[PDB]
Amino acid sequence: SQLFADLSREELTAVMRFLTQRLGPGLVDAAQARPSDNCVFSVELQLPPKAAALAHLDRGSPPPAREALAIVFFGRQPQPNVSELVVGPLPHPSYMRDVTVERHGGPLPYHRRPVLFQEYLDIDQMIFNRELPQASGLLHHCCFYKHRGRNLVTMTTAPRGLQSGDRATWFGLYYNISGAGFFLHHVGLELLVNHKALDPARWTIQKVFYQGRYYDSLAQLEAQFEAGLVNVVLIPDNGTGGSWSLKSPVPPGPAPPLQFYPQGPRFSVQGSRVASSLWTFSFGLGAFSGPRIFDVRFQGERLVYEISLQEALAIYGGNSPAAMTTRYVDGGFGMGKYTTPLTRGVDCPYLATYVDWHFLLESQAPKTIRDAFCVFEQNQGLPLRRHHSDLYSHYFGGLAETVLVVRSMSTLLNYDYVWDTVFHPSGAIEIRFYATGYISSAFLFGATGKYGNQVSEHTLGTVHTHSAHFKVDLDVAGLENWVWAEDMVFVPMAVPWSPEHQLQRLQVTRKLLEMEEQAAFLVGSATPRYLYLASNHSNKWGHPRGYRIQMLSFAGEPLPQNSSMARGFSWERYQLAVTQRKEEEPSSSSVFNQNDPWAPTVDFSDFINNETIAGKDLVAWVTAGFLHIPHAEDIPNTVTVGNGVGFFLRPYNFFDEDPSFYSADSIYFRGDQDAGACEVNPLACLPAPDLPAFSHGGFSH
Amino acid sequence: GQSQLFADLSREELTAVMRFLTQRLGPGLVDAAQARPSDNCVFSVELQLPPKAAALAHLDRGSPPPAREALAIVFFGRQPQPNVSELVVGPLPHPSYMRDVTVERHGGPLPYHRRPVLFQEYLDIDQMIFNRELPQASGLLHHCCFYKRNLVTMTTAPRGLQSGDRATWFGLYYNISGAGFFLHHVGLELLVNHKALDPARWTIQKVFYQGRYYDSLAQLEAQFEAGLVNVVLIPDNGTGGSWSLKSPVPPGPAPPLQFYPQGPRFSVQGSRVASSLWTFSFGLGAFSGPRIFDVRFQGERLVYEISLQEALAIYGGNSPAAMTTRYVDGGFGMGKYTTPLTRGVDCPYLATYVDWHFLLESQAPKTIRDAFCVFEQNQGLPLRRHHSDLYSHYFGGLAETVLVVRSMSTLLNYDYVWDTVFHPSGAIEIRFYATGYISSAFLFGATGKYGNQVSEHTLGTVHTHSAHFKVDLDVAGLENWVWAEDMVFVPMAVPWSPEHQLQRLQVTRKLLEMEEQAAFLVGSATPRYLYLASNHSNKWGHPRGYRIQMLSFAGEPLPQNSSMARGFSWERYQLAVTQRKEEEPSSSSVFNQNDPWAPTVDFSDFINNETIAGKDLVAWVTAGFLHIPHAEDIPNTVTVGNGVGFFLRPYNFFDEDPSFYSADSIYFRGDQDAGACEVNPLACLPQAAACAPDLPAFSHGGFSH
Ligand SMILES: *[C@@H]1O[C@H](CO)[C@@H](O[C@@H]2O[C@H](CO)[C@@H](O[C@H]3O[C@H](CO)[C@@H](O)[C@H](O)[C@@H]3O)[C@H](O)[C@H]2NC(C)=O)[C@H](O)[C@H]1NC(C)=O
Ligand SMILES: *[C@@H]1O[C@H](CO)[C@@H](O[C@@H]2O[C@H](CO)[C@@H](O[C@H]3O[C@H](CO)[C@@H](O)[C@H](O)[C@@H]3O)[C@H](O)[C@H]2NC(C)=O)[C@H](O)[C@H]1NC(C)=O
Ligand SMILES: *[C@@H]1O[C@H](CO)[C@@H](O[C@@H]2O[C@H](CO)[C@@H](O)[C@H](O)[C@H]2NC(C)=O)[C@H](O)[C@H]1NC(C)=O
Ligand SMILES: *[C@@H]1O[C@H](CO)[C@@H](O[C@@H]2O[C@H](CO)[C@@H](O)[C@H](O)[C@H]2NC(C)=O)[C@H](O)[C@H]1NC(C)=O
Ligand SMILES: *[C@@H]1O[C@H](CO)[C@@H](O)[C@H](O)[C@H]1NC(C)=O
Ligand SMILES: *[C@@H]1O[C@H](CO)[C@@H](O)[C@H](O)[C@H]1NC(C)=O
Ligand SMILES: *[C@@H]1O[C@H](CO)[C@@H](O)[C@H](O)[C@H]1NC(C)=O
Ligand SMILES: *[C@@H]1O[C@H](CO)[C@@H](O)[C@H](O)[C@H]1NC(C)=O
Ligand SMILES: [Ca+2]
C-alpha cells in the first residue's frame, strides 16, 4: 500500500500524541466528554492533493507529505466551535494547521457537531432517571415498566429540530429485546429531547407523543392517564418467530455450495493495494464517507483516480413525530465508523481474504474493526461471452466470468448497508449497494394506511426512501475529458429502391455536453441512453476513448426542494452530474450536514455553476436509490434480492477490441478437434480444499 | 396429481406422432429437410400444452390428467391453394386422432408465404446465388474478394415491403474459418425474390455494392469492366480477434470452482426440478423458447407459467440489409436454435445438464445434447444479515444460494442466454443476456449516424433488443387483482410547531381495474410498486401479493406509423396485465416474422376493455436495451451490464420472510463461541469439506450438420 492507505494504528497514535501536546492539557477523552469540554472527535487520513499524487505515481516526483485530518470539539470557551486541523507530516508529525475557515469561510457552529456517545448516555440518564418515572403509571400498564430495570431502550432520529441551530432529537422507546432486533418493538412512546445546552442539566423535554396524541411533558401524560382519559393496552414483551428472533428453528442441513481456488489465489492483497493479473487498485474507508477505491489500473493503464461513497440518505414517512420527521444523512454517523466485521462464509465467501481496519474516533487510542474488508475472486457461473457455431464452420469459444470483489458493511443502527466494488475482466467496474438488517418500525396505532404496512402485531413498517451518492473520478486516458450523450432516433424516409414505400430509419444521435448544467440530470427527467466521459484521443478505429456510465437505480421521488432542509443533501435531486474536479470540492456531503441541514456545511448543488466540462479534469457524481414500503417479508430482515443499486463503468471504444480476447482462461475448440483432449481444452485437464479454521471478529463495547 | 403434464415430447413420442401423420397426410409427403416449396411436408412437431383448467384439476383436485397431445405444423404446397396448417395429434403415447385447428385459431387458412423459410429453401437460394448469379460478375469478384467457394450468404429480417412479399436481402461474407463470418461483410448485398413456388422463377430484384445500387449483377460487372467502379479492396484474412476467437495467451492458474461439500441439494427428474424450497417444471417451445410451469414455493403455487414469448432486434444502417432488418426471432425459433452448453463455460462445471429433443424440418427426432443446466450457485453475497454492537451483541445472517435453470439460443450470430433464478426468499428472477457476434455491415460512407467502426472495413450497426415474457402469476389462487402503490409528498404544518412546514411522505394505493389501466407504454412512468394480489390477506391484513420489478433499459420502440409494427405490438408496452385466456396463449407467432404486416398474432388485441378485478390475470413484461456496437464487442459482446429481465418479489404474500426458517442461516450471541461447531455450522466446514469430489470427465454435446 502507500499513498492512499488509511492511517495505521502507529500513525494514529503518533497524531494523537502530537495533539495531546499542542492542545491545552484539560483536553478530555472524547469517550467521556461533556458538551463544554475540549475533545478530539476523530483523526483520519487526509487525502493527498491530486496533482502532487499523480506527480509521484506517474512521473517519479516524491510523495506528498502524508497528513492526518483531526476534527476537534472546542467547547471549553466563550465561543465554542468545531475545528478541522491538518496534522503532519507522518510518520513523525511536526506541524498542525487549522484549515477550518479556509474550507468553510468561518468557524463551524458547535451545534453541527455529531452527537457524541457520552451525549447519548446523558440523554438516556435524563430520560430513564428523571423523566420516565413520572409516567411509571402508564408505563406499567402498557409496557411492563419497572424501577429502572429497565426493559426499555431508545433510538435516535433524524435531523435534530426544525431550523438551523436546533439540537432537539425525537427518540422512540423500544423493548430492550435480547439477542435480536429491538427495532421492531416500538412501545408507543416518543420523546422530543432538547439537548442544545452545554450543561446537560439545562436539558429539557420539549414534547411527548403517545397514541396519536401530544403532551408538553410526561407528567401531563401520566395525568391524563390517571384521569382515565387514555386507553392503555398491555404490549407483550416476549414472542416467537422472526418478529422476536433471528435464529432459525430448523436444524442445519447439507452445506451450501462452496468455491475454492484449485491452484491457489489469483490475486494478492498487500497492505491495502490489490493486484490481480488484470487489476491493481487501493481501497479503504473514510470514517464518515465510507468505502473508497483509488488509482484503478486495468492492465497498467489508469481508468479512475477515485471512486468513493459520498453519502447515504433515508427519508421517512409516518404516523408519529419521530418517523415523520426523520431524514438520516448517514455520514453524520459515519459509514466507516459504523462498519462491522464480516462473518466469514456469510458476509463473504469462506475463502475470501479478510482485512482489518483501524480508526481513532471518540477515544484517545486506536481501535480496530477485525475483518472489515473482504477481497475475493468469485466464479459467477455465467459466461462473460460465448458463441457456439453450427453454421458454415464448427467451433465454440467462450469464457466463464470470474470477478474480483472488494466489500465492507456499515451497520447504521438498524440497517446493514453492503458496499460492493466489482472488477470485471471485460474492464468494467461495477459499484453496488445493498441494504439489509432491520427496518425502523413505528408503534401501530390509528390510521396507518398512508404511512406503511402492518408487518407484525404492533408494528408499523414505515415508508421511506433510500439513496446513496457516489464520487466517480474517471480519468479516461488522461485528465482532459469530455462528456458525450449518445442515443437513438427514428426518422421516416423513403425506401431507396422502392421510393413509393416508407421505412422508419433508425439512427444514432450524438451530442457533446460542454457545460456542467448540460450534464446534470435530475431524478425523474430522462437521461441519454449512452452517457460517457471521453478523451480527445481515439482508439484504433477513430472513436473517442470512452468510459460509459450506466446506472442501476429505482429512485424514489427526492425530498421536494421547498423543504427548508433539502439543501443538506441536494445531490438527492440528481441522478447523474459531471463537474470540474476541484481540490476544494472533495465531497458532496459532510459529517456536519446531518445536525444542521438547514445551513449545510457542504451543498452539492454549488458544484454545478456554469463552468466548462469540455477538455477538463472531470468528476462524475451518481445517485442511486429506491422507494421502500416495508412488508411482511422484511421480518426479521429485509433481503438483498432485487435491492442492489449503483452503476457500471463500461469501456466504450476505450480499447481496440475486447481485452478478454487475450484471456488466460478462455476456451476454444473446433468441431474437427477432440474437445475432451487436455491439449485442446484446459477444461479437460481438471484436475483439499484447505479451509482456515473459522474465527469471528467479535463485538464492540 | 402426479404427472408431468408440461414435459416436452420425447423421441418415442415424437416418432409416434410422425408415424401417425405419415399415414394420414397421404401421397407425396416429403421429408422437409429436402422439401421444395411445392412439396407437402411436416415442418414441426412439438408438445401441445394442456388447457389450464384441466391441468389444474389434475394437479390440485386429483382429477385424471388431460390428454397429452402434439401440435404439428404442416406445409401444404402440393395443391391449387397452398396453406400452412396446424394439426393436433393425440393422445400420446399411442395417438389415434388428428384435428386441424388452423381455422379455430386463425379464423381462416394460413397464407403460405408466412411459413418460415426452410433450410432447403436457404440452400436453393444459395444455388441461384452462387451458380447463376455471382458468376455473371466473376470479373469484379476476382478483383475484389478472391473469387474463383470462399463466400457465404446470411439472411435478414422481414422479406419485402407489404404483406405477401418474400424478398430477402442477403449480405455476402468471407467464409471465415473457425471464427465468425459476421465481421467480414465484403460489401455486396442481393435482394433475392424467392416468393415463387418454382425456385427457377426466383430472381434478383436489386444489387448493392459498396455504397452503390445496381439493377442487376450484369450491370455491375459492366461498369466494373468499363473501369467505372471504384472497388474497395477488403482483406480475406487477418489476425486480431476480429479474425480469431482463440486466445493467443497460454492457460494460467485455474479459475475458482464451485462444489457441494455434502452432496447436491436439489434433484432433476425428467423435466421436474425439486429442492427443499422449490419445485417447478421446465422446457423449451420450438419457437417461443424457455418456459417453466407450476412453480411451487414450499408447496404453494405462485406461477402457473413463466415463458419467453418473443425476441426482437431492430437495426439501422445505410446498407439496405441492416437498414431494414427487424428480426422477430420466434420465426426462426429459440428452441429450435438452442445449443449445447459447454460444461464449465456456459454453466458451472458441476451443474446438472439435460438433453432436449425435437422434430423440426426432419422426419426423425433429434437431440440437442446438454441443452439445459440446473445448478445451485453460491451468490457470494448475503441474502440478509445483521451485526449488532448495540445493547445486545449478536450476529444473524444467511449467505445467498440460488437455484438456476439456463438454456442458450444461438440465432445466427447472437447467443441469447436465458436464466430462471429461484431465490430462497420466495423471489423469482428472470434474466436474458445477449452475447456472441454482432451483425455487421461493410463500413462505408456516412456511418456515424448508424454505428461505430469496430474493425477494418467493419461497421457495428446500431440496433435495439427486446424480449417479451409471459408471467401467469396465480397469487394465492386464480382470482387476482392488480395494485399500484407509490409515494407522494404532501406539504403541511408540523403538527406540534405550526410555525414550521414539513413535506409529509405518504404511500399511494390505487386499484387498477381494467386492462388499459394496467398497460404501460415504454417511456411513460410506472408505479414504483406494481403487484398482482389476492383479496385474501396475510396475517396482518394486507392483500397477499407478488410484485413485478422490471430491469430493462428499453430503446424507443419501432414507431407505430410503420406498416409492420403490428407484428410485434408488445414492443411498445413495458408491462401489461390481461385476463388469461386459452385462446390467447402467446403474444407472438412463428408466422409473424415473414409477414409482420398481416400479423398472425397481434399482442395489442389482448388489451381490450375487460376487467382485471378478481380474474385469472396474466402479466406480460417487455425488457430490452439499445445497442450501439463498439470496439469491446469484438470478437463478442460481453454479458456484463447486459442482463435484462424482471423479478417477482413477494409482497405481504407471506406472514414473514420465509428465509427465517432456512436450514443454512447462521446465528450466535456475543457470549457464545462463534468458533464452536455446536453454535455455528461454519465452524465445522474445515473437517468435512476437505473432501472435493472427483470431477466427471469433460464431454461436449457436439455440433450439428
Ligand atoms: C476555534 O477555537 C480555537 C481555539 O479554541 C481557535 O484557535 C485558537 O485560536 C487562539 C487565538 O485565536 C490561539 O491561541 C493563541 O493566542 C495567543 C495570543 O495571546 C497566541 O499568540 C498563541 O498562538 C496562542 O496559542 C490558538 O492557537 C488556537 N488554538 C488552535 C489549536 O489553533 C480558533 O480560532 C477558533 N476558530 C475560529 C474560526 O474562531
Ligand atoms: C388447408 O390444406 C389442407 C389441404 O391439404 C386441407 O385439408 C384437406 O382438405 C380436404 C377437404 O377439405 C380433405 O380431403 C377430402 O377429400 C375428399 C373428397 O372426395 C373428402 O370428401 C374427404 O373428406 C377427404 O378427407 C383432406 O383430408 C384435408 N386434409 C387434412 C389433414 O385436413 C384444408 O382443408 C385446407 N384448409 C384451409 C383452411 O383452406
Ligand atoms: C466454409 O469454410 C469452412 C472452413 O471451416 C468449411 O468447413 C469445412 O468443410 C469441409 C469440406 O469442404 C469439411 O470436411 C469440414 O468438416 C469443414 N470444417 C469445419 C470446422 O466445419 C466449409 O466447407 C466452407 N463452407 C462454405 C459454404 O463455404
Ligand atoms: C438490555 O438487555 C441486554 C440483554 O440482552 C443487556 O445486555 C447484557 O448486559 C448484561 C449485564 O447487564 C451482560 O452480562 C450481558 O452479557 C449482556 N448481553 C449481550 C449478549 O450483549 C443490557 O443490560 C440491557 N441494556 C440496556 C441499555 O438496557
Ligand atoms: C488532446 O488535447 C491536448 C491539448 O489540450 C493535447 O496535448 C493532446 O495531444 C490532444 N490530442 C488530440 C486532439 O488528438
Ligand atoms: C455562463 O458562463 C459564461 C462565461 O463563459 C458567462 O458569460 C455566462 O453569463 C454565464 N451564465 C450565467 C447564467 O452565469
Ligand atoms: C374476494 O372477492 C370476491 C368478490 O367478488 C368475493 O366473492 C370473495 O368472497 C372475496 N374474498 C375475500 C376474502 O375478500
Ligand atoms: C368499456 O367498459 C364499460 C362497460 O362495463 C363501458 O361503459 C364502456 O363504454 C366500454 N367501452 C367499449 C368496450 O368500447
Ligand atoms: Ca477525472
Ligand SMILES: [Ca+2]
Ligand atoms: Ca463547478
Ligand SMILES: [Ca+2]
Ligand atoms: Ca394467473
Ligand SMILES: [Ca+2]
Ligand atoms: Ca383482454
Ligand SMILES: [Cu+2]
Ligand atoms: Cu428500506
Ligand SMILES: [Cu+2]
Ligand atoms: Cu446487440
